[PDB]
Amino acid sequence: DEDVKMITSLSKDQQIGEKIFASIAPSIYGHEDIKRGLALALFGGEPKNPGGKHKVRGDINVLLCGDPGTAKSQFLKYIEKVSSRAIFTTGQGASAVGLTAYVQRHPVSREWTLEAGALVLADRGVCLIDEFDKMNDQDRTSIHEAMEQQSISISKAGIVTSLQARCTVIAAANPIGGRYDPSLTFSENVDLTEPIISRFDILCVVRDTVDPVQDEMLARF
Amino acid sequence: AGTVVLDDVELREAQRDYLDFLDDEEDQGIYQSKVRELISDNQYRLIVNVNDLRRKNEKRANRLLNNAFEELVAFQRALKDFVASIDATYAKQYEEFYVGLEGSFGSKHVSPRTLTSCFLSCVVCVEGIVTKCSLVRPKVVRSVHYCPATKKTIERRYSDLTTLVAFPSSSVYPTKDEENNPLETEYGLSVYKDHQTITIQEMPEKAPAGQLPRSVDVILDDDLVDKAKPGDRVQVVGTYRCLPGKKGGYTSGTFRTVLIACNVKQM
Ligand SMILES: Nc1ncnc2c1ncn2[C@@H]1O[C@H](COP(=O)(O)OP(=O)(O)OP(=O)(O)O)[C@@H](O)[C@H]1O
Numbered sequence A: 001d002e003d004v005k006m007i008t009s010l011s012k013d014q015q016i017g018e019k020i021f022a023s024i025a026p027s028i029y030g031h032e033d034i035k036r037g038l039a040l041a042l043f044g045g046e047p048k049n050p051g052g053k054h055k056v057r058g059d060i061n062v063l064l065c066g067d068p069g070t071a072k073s074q075f076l077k078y079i080e081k082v083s084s085r086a087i088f089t090t091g092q093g094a095s096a097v098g099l100t101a102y103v104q105r106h107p108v109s110r111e112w113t114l115e116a117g118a119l120v121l122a123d124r125g126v127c128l129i130d131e132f133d134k135m136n137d138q139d140r141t142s143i144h145e146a147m148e149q150q151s152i153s154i155s156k157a158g159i160v161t162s163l164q165a166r167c168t169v170i171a172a173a174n175p176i177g178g179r180y181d182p183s184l185t186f187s188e189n190v191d192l193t194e195p196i197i198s199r200f201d202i203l204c205v206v207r208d209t210v211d212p213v214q215d216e217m218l219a220r221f
Numbered sequence B: 001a002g003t004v005v006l007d008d009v010e011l012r013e014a015q016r017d018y019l020d021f022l023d024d025e026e027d028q029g030i031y032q033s034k035v036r037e038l039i040s041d042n043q044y045r046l047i048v049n050v051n052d053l054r055r056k057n058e059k060r061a062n063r064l065l066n067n068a069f070e071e072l073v074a075f076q077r078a079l080k081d082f083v084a085s086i087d088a089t090y091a092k093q094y095e096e097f098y099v100g101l102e103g104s105f106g107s108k109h110v111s112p113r114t115l116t117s118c119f120l121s122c123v124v125c126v127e128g129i130v131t132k133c134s135l136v137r138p139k140v141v142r143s144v145h146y147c148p149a150t151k152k153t154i155e156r157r158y159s160d161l162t163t164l165v166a167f168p169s170s171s172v173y174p175t176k177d178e179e180n181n182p183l184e185t186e187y188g189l190s191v192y193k194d195h196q197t198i199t200i201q202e203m204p205e206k207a208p209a210g211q212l213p214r215s216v217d218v219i220l221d222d223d224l225v226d227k228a229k230p231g232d233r234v235q236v237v238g239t240y241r242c243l244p245g246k247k248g249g250y251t252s253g254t255f256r257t258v259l260i261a262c263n264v265k266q267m
């Protein structure tokens, strides 16, 4: 009850937006623009569908491309910590949660289960993918289907289903050669394809450059 | 068992009806030449159109489709009578002859997915593909034994699936004489008949997309042993019956349903 009044009082403050922007990721120095974008990504928008004909989503996807050592994964860890419903997965392999739905006998409970991917589990939530370039064919296909149609179709073991995938996607990746090239476009620097990049609303580029003062401050922290 | 039956209106009338059905004297029927062909070819079963029977006698067709075993027994008795009538010499070779069925069954034309308990004990038609087959195995019908100690030979008769339910008194193989003199089995004089089991699955072209298939199990008797092979598309007409489980105290109440073929057709 009083929490609602406190929320309204904080809203009455004229600089609440900057407070929220600076409130994200206390443990990461710099990258203020990334935090500002993640603010909008977390708060989100509003879907619109006039009748049952024209669906427009309100989820703001985020893509990060960075040189090694820029702490891309720490942002995803913080987002998972803060978000009420957030799923984390990695494309390199051996992930705790898969990225594709399948029907299997669970090793522990020994029961016949339908395990949907991380995309399905995060209904009205956030899905985080690390090592975005390392993903194989199946993961890329499932991600493309979930981002463009916002639904996942399953036809396996006599089961035919369609499941809702209303989720916000945040991803991190590294350039092709291991270092970003300012003389080439974003698409030429990244292993991903243009249709996949086109889905993301916000693209962030983190380029490592030798600044003595910034390096000194980062080392101090 | 000394129990015998003296009168039975239904069975006698049904036998008379089949006798009139298979006469073909005052009619354009062909079954007489069919029987002559069977005698010529040494085969011992007949195929009769169901639609023809319904046209000639609708009540008999209705009863046969609704009730199978007794009507089939009456058919076999009538075949024995007419084979004896035309040529009694040929009827000596075989114990009993058999009847096949053919024609458009209509509502009873049933897919392996749509076979239900509603069609139990009736004659059904099914279209499918063959997936599993088993080796041909002989089965004993009449056994003959000889006693070197007393120079006497005996014979025992077996009837297991002829009767619906069997008991431990039957199906016992004799090995000793009344005075414990050993008996020697003489395999030449005994009688055996072949036996096979196959499995039929609903064709993938007909099954609904994305759904698992359903299958039926079929038993092939002595005549129809080699008529089927795996990977083949066939149509089977036959009875649909329950399978008697072996003796026990507590039963869960679930039977096994097995289709006993009478006609197998390569479409
Ligand atoms: N601005 C920063 N503030 C705090 N720690 C940082 C910062 N930049 C880098 N680091 C540290 O650098 C280390 C590099 O590991 P990290 O997993 O964060 O890298 P990454 O950017 O995800 O790299 P990769 O491209 O190899 O996946 C981490 O221990 C992280 O804490």
Ligand SMILES: [Mg+2]
Binding pocket: A072, A073, A130
């Ligand atoms: Mg990382």
